[PDB]
Amino acid sequence: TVDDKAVDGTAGGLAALVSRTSDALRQVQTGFARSYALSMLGGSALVVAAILAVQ
Amino acid sequence: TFPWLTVLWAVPVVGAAVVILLPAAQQVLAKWLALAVSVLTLAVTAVVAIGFDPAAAQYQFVESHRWIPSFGTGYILGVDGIALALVVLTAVLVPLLIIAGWNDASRQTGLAGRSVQAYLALTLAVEGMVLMSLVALDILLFYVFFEAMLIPMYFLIGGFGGENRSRAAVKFLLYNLFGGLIMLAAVIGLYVVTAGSDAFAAGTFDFREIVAAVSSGEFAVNPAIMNFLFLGFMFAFAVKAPLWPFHRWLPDAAVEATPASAVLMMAVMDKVGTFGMLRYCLQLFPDASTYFRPVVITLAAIGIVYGAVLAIGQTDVMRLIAYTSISHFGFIILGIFVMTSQGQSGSTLYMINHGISTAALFLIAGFLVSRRGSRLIDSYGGVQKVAPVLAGTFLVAGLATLSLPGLAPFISEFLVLIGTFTRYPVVAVFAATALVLSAVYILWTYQRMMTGPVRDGIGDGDRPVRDLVPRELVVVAPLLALLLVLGIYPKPALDVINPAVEHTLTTIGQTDPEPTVP
Amino acid sequence: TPSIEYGLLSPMLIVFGVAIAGVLIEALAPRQSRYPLQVTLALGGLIATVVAVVFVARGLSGTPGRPAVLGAVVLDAPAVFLQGTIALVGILGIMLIAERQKATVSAGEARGLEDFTPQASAVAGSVAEQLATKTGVMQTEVFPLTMFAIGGMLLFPAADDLLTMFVALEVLSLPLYLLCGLARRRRLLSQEAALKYFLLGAFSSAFFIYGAAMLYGSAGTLDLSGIAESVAAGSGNTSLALLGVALLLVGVLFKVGAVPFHSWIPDVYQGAPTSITAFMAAATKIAAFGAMLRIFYVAVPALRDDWRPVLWAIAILTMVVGTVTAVTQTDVKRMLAYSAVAHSGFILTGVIAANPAGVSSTLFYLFAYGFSTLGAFAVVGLIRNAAGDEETSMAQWAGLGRRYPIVGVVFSLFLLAFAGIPLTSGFVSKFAVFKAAGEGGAIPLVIIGVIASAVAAYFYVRVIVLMFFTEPPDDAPELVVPSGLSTAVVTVTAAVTFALGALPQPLLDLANSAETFL
Amino acid sequence: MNPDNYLYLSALLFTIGAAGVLLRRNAIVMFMCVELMLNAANLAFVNFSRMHGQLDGQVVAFFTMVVAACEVVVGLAIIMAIFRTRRSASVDDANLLKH
Amino acid sequence: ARTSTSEAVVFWVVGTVALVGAIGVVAARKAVYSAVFLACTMISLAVLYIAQDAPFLGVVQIVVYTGAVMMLFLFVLMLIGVDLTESLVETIKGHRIAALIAGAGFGILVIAGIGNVSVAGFSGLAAANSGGNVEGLAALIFTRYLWAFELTSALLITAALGAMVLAHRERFERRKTQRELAIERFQTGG
């Protein structure tokens, strides 16, 4: 039980986490060019990070 | 000055290239040519071993060329006692695995008729890449081959296997490649550290120079960085050579892959993990290895007992042998990391003996599984009556994996256990229990299969269990012969291994503890 | 008067003159003779460009480099390296683009295997489009457009000032905007891809120009060296320098496809013509990364402590989101798109090194990766549904390798290179960038890239599983080899990906010699 | 009036342009918003060139205008092809490639 | 650094026009209104260029963008509609708020980055425009920026090629001539 559920189960849980995160990220590609543009404009994260790099 | 080591690894790869390039119609010629290349590599191994003087310097047959100076790595080969031992193991096994998997690729379709040729070429490429890893005295070269040899075997598992071949192949490759990539992180960290230290002219991968510097104390580095790099190496070598927690991939693949390929994975390739643990981890990171020595020792002993127990609990022959190999890998790692001359020498001889013993036992079980297409233990019974020679060889192999003194593996397990007692007696007893556990999962398996009233369809019908054919006799006889010889007279192999072990223990600032009595 | 270094500017001048000549061929050459001349004029020109570059490389043997047009163009070792890489990749891309249909029974053979719709102005599936296909007409205007792109991508690494980089960025982007909408099949998807790429590229270019404005404001000049003197001299407005760097980075990251800006790549690479996909995924990545190397190693080194933390995050995201999103992608083209997304972050790690090893590793990475990606996309273009549509759903690829062992093996090599398994240029490539990052103080990025590569190996490996370890389905896609041009592309590309992985010191010495900017 | 005010206006204009590209479906409106961003960049160049006592930024404004014209024409071509196939110029409709 | 109060008045009125024009471009629900607002913004920016000692740039702005907005208006009438009043209703869940937030944040951040700059030295343009604003632009364009000027030709050619490849419709889709129509069993009258 330990082998099939703990040792194998930890790796399987990591795989399930990776797969769920992949699905969640893939939902981010809504296919709307304006959504991609919204992500790019939120790329002002870069502007704020570079400006805050002074402090 | 002849490139003996270079040719040793080159021949299998060139042979794979020729084989895969043969016309599909030359399948028989392909089999024979692959066997011939394996035998030629074994002859090269024979000359290398004969010319090797264990009383002489630590590294022999040293070949050196510039390969990638930008990365501080050069094509540097050189075989020591331990590398020589594992090279001999790989060379003696590979032809036997070839004649063992003679018909393994027959029932495949596709590949434009090259399924047999692909099988053989993949086997040869695995053999050569393992050899390159063994004789490589360059850290980056060794990592290159150590990681890459995963791919030929990934194919060899995925193609030429059972229904779960895809899943088991993926799990194997991903586990091992994740470990290898962690070791890549560690390798790059080591390069940065060497570049940051005045001991080297530049960021270096030359194993000998780095070892000399760390021993001489000039290459003094923060213990934290050394700990992390050691852990990076350890993760990869542990997933490769299965240390208890990380063993999980090996059972499935060994089950799914054809028996010859599974043996090539376990007996030969997985050894490379422990080999690396012996050559690099200890001789690159002595202080870190010592600091982590208790934890790794604990993991190895737990793996011994845990694999023994699981093998006991396995209903599947192949899964049982895989877990048995896991427990034996626990023995090997325990003996290597106890840093005792008895321990390390016994664990090297244990790599040899376990390779041969698992090869024999697993191939015999593979023949039995071929006869009747079930891997379930309960599917058999009273096979000893129908196929007396098969049962006799299976029992002999089990005895070998059981660590019986009349056979080779005992000489090693004993040596390892003895070694463990001088530094961790509790752990030594904990592992010694595996002597009982081995009897359990070996003799109970033989009882369930070979003894009792003959099961249905065993001696009759379309799936009878016919005795060993002459080819299986050729596969089996040399393995049992080596087991007998090394059990009775391990003196030559031990004499080769001991100088290397003594060199290593001198390198890492460790010595066999003095006896209690003055 | 101005002095024009014609010998220096020779490659770009040759490409742009060839593009102009190709437009002339379109303008005043009869239909039946247009394609033979264009493919003649284009390929030769690029070959000539390649030749020019090597002579220019000989020209820069003594001096590190030189500006050409009173600034605004500097041919230094990195510039010639990137220009040569782009020239070779353009030759391969145009060999893909020139591939005509496999004349079956009719003479309507017309540049369809290149996947270009006979008349892009026609409504997809209209009677006019069908009649054009039957008549075998091709819009040869593709060849000039492609050439123009190369011209821009040749300049964009070599541009030595903000105005020239912006003009080159537009000059390379507009051709690609147009090309993305000309696919022969799934015309709706290609048109959508063209619209998305145009809209997002125009957005990114607007950011690029606004950042150029801010940098000019801070520095009082727009020659890169002048900007570096200003920022290092502390005379300019530091806040404006930072804001301009960030806004410029927005555009360049869109061009390479960092996760905050990558969203276009999946769709565009899926819907664009497979030939144009292969061409762009290499050429645009190379040109954008060359320009970014120039900006971060020439224009604004002194502000490293200011922009290092940003790229860090981006790289992290790029490697994670790029790889994780690919794990569960089910379309081969889209999976390769996300693979490119991840390798953009891998490159950015070696850019973050901010040390000469960073530049050398980045240049090698771009060369090897561009070649590998071009080959992989060409192969994905060779696979066809029964209806002719490029079969891209991974399920239809089951047993593809078994039915076509040669192409299966080549594509598996490309996938392993992307994963970075040793013996492939992809390994050496990722190793170089990671080594630069670690030696530059960015070891944590090396660890995160290790983890991301471990995650990505899964989706790289599942495709090999589908090719080889699964039996082909009932409706398996057939391999169409339209012309010897595509075969030559595949062979050259795979051979490069393999040789440049086994013996990379050639071209790695050239990468090292290109470690300094003018 | 501090000359810096111009930059703020430019920053505002670009911002609005950006918002436009995110908010308006009609491809022509998106093109006009992109033109707004490019022209804001031009305004920043003109102000900075005035500040630095050189016509460089004014020159750069010409090339930006050229790029804006070429970009608008290319977008018009792409939109014409898409409109022929679909008879709609909305960007949201080009959603086939996704996930 | 404070420019003449006349320049202050010009900036305030004209930039008010420009900002309102951009806002109308984004907000007007009739595309023709948005086109006219764009024309207004371009005109205002041209006026600002002139006011900033950039006569030629402003004048060329007025000219070229008159042309450009005329064509964009034609394309609005073609592809969108003559007086179609678009809904401007958010179709992507919560996208409107996210776009407003991102745009406002980027604007605030860019303003913060710009901050006070002119106080750090504002060298008037008189030394440059002396001898001819257009003369100075010619000196720069054809001396230092000659390569970019040449590449503008590549931009032009690529635009033409895109227009011809994607827009021009070859013979197959050519509309029949009146001459052609009258013929064919006496079409349109039989």
Locate the domains of chain E by residue range. Answer: 5-171
Q: What are B387's strand-pairing partners?
A: none
The residues near B392 (Cβ < 8 Å, ≥ 6 apart) are: none
Min distance D97 CA to chain E CA atoms (Å): 16
Distance CA B260, CA B366 (A): 8
Q: Which residue has the tokens 């699981």?
A: B310
B374: helix, strand or coil: coil
Instruction: Of B63, B37, B34, give the one whose Cα is nearest residue B48.
Output: B63
Q: Which two tokens stand for residue B249?
A: 């991939």
Which long-range contacts link E71-75 to residues 24+ away (Cβ below 8 Å)? E71/D76, E72/D28, E72/D31, E72/D32, E72/D72, E72/E35, E72/E38, E73/E32, E73/E35, E73/E36, E75/D28, E75/D76, E75/D79
Contacts of E88 in chain A (CB under 8 A): none
Tell whether A21 lies on the interface with D, counting CB pairs under 8 A: no
Gap sites in chain B (C to N > 2.5 Å), preceding residue numbers: none
Q: Does E66 touch chain D (CB under 8 A)?
A: no
Per residue, the 3-state secondary structure of E156-174, as one string, reads: HHHHHHHHHHHHCCCHHHC
Vertex C149 angle, CA C144 and C153, to 5°:
145
Minimal-distance CA residue of chain C relative to A25: C325
Kindly list the residues from chain C whose CB atom is less than 8 angstroms away from the CB atom of residue B165: 469
Say if the Cβ atoms of A33 and C195 lie within 8 Å.
yes
Would the CB atoms of B144 and C508 count as touching at under 8 Å?
Answer: no
Distances (CA, A) of C419 to C250, C298, C461, C464, E17: 27, 31, 9, 12, 55
Closest CB to B68: pick one of C419, C450, C505: C505
* CB C397, CB C463: distance < 8 Å: yes
- Pairwise CB contact (< 8 Å): A38 & D96: no
**Rg of the Cα atoms in chain A:** 19
Q: Which C residues 464-503 touch B at CB under 8 Å?
A: 464-465, 468-472, 503
Backbone angles phi, psi at A43, to 5 degrees: -50, -10
Report the gap between the CA of D47 and the closest CA in chain E (Å).
Answer: 7
Q: Which residues of C touch D79 (CB under 8 A)?
A: 195
Asked if C57 and C493 count as a contact pair (C-beta separation under 8 A), the reply is no
- Give the whole-angstrom CA distance, residue B52 versus residue B87: 12
CB atoms within 10 A of CB E82: 10
> Strand, coil or helix: what is C263?
coil
CB-CB neighbors (< 8 A) of E145 in chain C: 72, 163-164
**Chain centroid to CA C102: how far?**
27
C and E touch with 3+ CB pairs <8 Å, answer: yes
Task: Name every chain A residue with its beta carbon within 8 A of the beta carbon of D93.
Answer: none
Residues of chain E with C-beta less than 8 angstroms from the C-beta of D81: 166-167
Length of chain E: 190
Considering CB atoms only, which of D22, D91, D98 is closest to A38?
A: D22
- CB–CB contact A25 C325 (8 Å): yes
Rounded distance between C-alpha atoms, residue B338 and residue C328, angstroms: 44
Instruction: Yes or no: say if B286 and B509 are a contact pair by the CB < 8 Å rule.
Output: yes
Query: Is E142's Cβ below 8 Å from some Cβ in D?
Result: no
For B17-33, what is the HEC assignment? HHHHCCCHHHHHHHHHH
Instruction: Give the gap in angstroms from C-alpha E124 to the nearest C-alpha of chain C.
Output: 13
Q: Which amino acid is at C110?
A: A
Name the one residue in this structure whose structure tokens are 């013993």. Answer: B357
Which CATH class, in words, describes the domain spanning D3-93? mainly alpha
CA-wise closest residue to C250 among D41, B170, B139, B491: D41
3-state secondary structure of C418: helix
Which tokens go with C15? 């490409």
CB contact under 8 A, E19 and D23: no
Tell me the sheet residues that pair with B68: B73
Q: Could you tell me if residue A30 is left (phi over 0), alpha (psi between -120 and 50 degrees) or otherwise beta?
A: alpha
| Alpha carbons C428 and C364: distance in angstroms, whole number | 9
Please answer whether residues C366 and C290 qualify as being in contact, where contact means their C-beta atoms are separated by less than 8 angstroms: yes
Do C446 and B70 lie within an 8 Å CB cutoff? no
Chain A residue closest in CA terms to B313: A1
- Which residues have a Cβ under 8 Å from the Cβ of E157 and sit 6 or more positions away? C19, C20, C23, C144, C148
Structure token digits, residue C366? 């771009």
For residue C337 the two structure tokens come to 């798109």
Resolution, given in Å to one decimal, reads 2.8
Task: Give phi and psi for D87, each to the nearest 5.
Answer: 70, 20
Structure token digits, residue B505: 């223990």
**Rounded to an integer, what distance in angstroms lies between the CA atom of residue C249 and that of residue B21?**
49
Phi, psi (degrees; rounded to nearest 5) at E67: -60, -45
D85: buried, middle or exposed (CB in 10 Å: 19+, 13-18, 0-12)? middle
The Cα–Cα gap between B489 and B54 comes to 17
Parallel/antiparallel/unpaired status of strands C383-384 and B60-68: unpaired
**Method used for this model?**
cryo-EM
In A, which residues are within 8 Å of B167 by CB distance?
A: none
- DSSP letters, D21-48, are HHH--BHHHHHHHHHHHHHHHHHHHHHH
B68, B147, B166: residue with CB nearest C508: B68
Tokens of C178: 């147009």
- CA atoms of B461 and C248, how far apart (whole Å): 78
C429: which DSSP letter? H
Give, in order, the Cα–Cα distances in Å from D89 to each of C121, C267, E35, E92.
15, 19, 16, 17
Asked: is E5-171 a CATH 1.20.120.1200 domain? The reply is yes
If you count them, how many residues does chain B have?
518
Angle between helices C238-256 and C332-352 (to 10 degrees): 150
Cα–Cα distance, C494 to C500 (Å, whole number)? 10
What is the Cα–Cα distance from B167 to C469, expressed in whole angstroms? 10
User: CA B132, B135, B137, B142 torsion: positive or negative?
Assistant: positive
Q: Which two tokens stand for residue C193?
A: 């891809």
Q: Encode D41-63: b = buried (16+ Cβ within 10 Å), e = exposed.
A: bbbbbbbbbbbbbbbbbbbbbbb
Radius of gyration (C-alpha) of chain C in whole angstroms: 22
* Bridge-based pairing state of the strands B60-68 and B73-79: antiparallel
Distance CA B496, CA B48 (A): 13
Query: Three-state SS for C183?
Result: strand
**Best interface-test mutation with A: which of E106, E110, E111 has the largest number of A CBs within 10 A?**
E106
Are residues C81 and C64 in contact, defined by beta-carbon separation less than 8 angstroms? no
E residues 94-123 near D, CB within 8 Å?
A: 95-96, 99-100, 102-104, 106-107, 110-111, 114, 116-119, 121-123
H helices present in C272-355, as ranges: 274-294, 304-327, 332-352
Copy the structure tokens of residue B246: 């990380």
Dihedrals phi, psi of B367, to nearest 5 degrees: -60, -45
Rounded CA-CA distance D39/D17 in Å is 10
What is the rounded (10 degree) CA torsion for C376, C381, C385, C387? 170
Q: CA–CA distance from C100 to each of C125, C130, C269 (Å)? A: 20, 17, 21
The Cα angle at residue E4 between residues E1 and E5, in degrees rounded to 5: 115
A26 contacts C328? CB cut-off 8 A: yes
Q: How far apart are the first and last CA of chain E?
A: 81
Give the one of B145, B166, B191 whose C-beta lies nearest to C435's C-beta: B191
User: With contact defined as beta carbons under 8 Å apart, do E157 and C20 qualify?
Assistant: yes
Q: Between D and E, how many residue pairs show a Cβ–Cβ distance under 8 A?
A: 230
**Nearest alpha carbon to residue B41 among B260, B240, B207, B268:** B268
> What percent of the residues of chain D are helix, what percent strand, and what percent coil, each to the nearest 5?
80, 0, 20
Classify residue B72 by its DSSP letter. Answer: T
Q: Do C200 and A37 touch (CB under 8 A)?
A: yes
Q: Which two tokens stand for residue C438?
A: 């670690």
Point out the residue among E99, E102, E109 whose CB comes nearest to the CB of A51.
Answer: E109
DSSP sequence for B206-246: BHHHHHHHHHHT-S---HHHHHHHHHHHHHHHHHHTT-GGG
Tell which residue, B131, B150, B124, has the closest CA to residue C420: B150
Backbone angles phi, psi at B505, to 5 degrees: -70, -35
Kindly report the nearest CA distance between residue B179 and chain A, in angstroms: 13
CB A3 to CB B248 under 8 A? yes
CB atoms under 10 Å from CB of B295, counted, come to 11
* Cross-chain CB nearest to C170 (options E145, E155, E167): E155
Residues in contact with B347: Cβ distance below 8 Å, sequence separation at least 6, in sequence order:
B274, B278, B331, B332, B333, B334, B335, B336, B412, B415, B416, B419
Distance CA C250, CA C257 (A): 10
**Closest residue on chain A to D16 (Cα):** A41
Nearest CA in chain A to C194: A33
Distance from CA of D59 to the nearest CA of E (A): 6
Measured CA to CA, the distance from residue C217 to residue C312 in angstroms comes to: 26
Q: Which two tokens stand for residue B497?
A: 């291994």
B376 forms beta bridges with B316
Pairwise CA distance, residues C68 & C77, whole Å: 14
Q: Which of C199, C238, C321 sits opposite A37 (nearest CB)?
A: C199
CA-CA-CA-CA dihedral for C330, C332, C337, C339, to nearest 10: 80
D contacts of C214 (beta carbons < 8 Å)? 44
| DSSP 8-state class, residue B280 | I
- Degrees to nearest 5, angle at CA B363 with B465 and B19: 115
> How many Å separate Cα E174 from the centre of its chain?
32
* Contact call for residues C167 and E151 (beta carbons, < 8 A): yes
Cα–Cα distance measured from residue B89 to residue B84, given in angstroms and rounded to the nearest whole number = 9
Q: Do E19 and D92 touch (CB under 8 A)?
A: no
Residues E171/C184, Cβ–Cβ less than 8 Å: no
CB distance B157 to B253 below 8 Å? yes
- E168 touching chain C per CB within 8 A: yes
By the 8 A CB rule, do B185 and C450 touch? yes
Nearest by CB to C324, from A22, A31, A39: name it: A22
Decide: helix, strand or coil at residue C223: strand
Contacts of B56 (CB under 8 A, 6+ apart): none
Query: Which residues of chain A neighbour E106 with C-beta distances below 8 Å?
Result: 41, 44, 47
**Neighbors of chain B with 3 or more C-beta pairs under 8 Å:** A, C
Do E and D touch (≥3 CB pairs < 8 Å)?
yes
Residue D43 has, within 13 A of its CA and on its CB side, a CA count of: 32
Would you kindly state where each structural domain of chain D is located, as residue ranges? 3-93
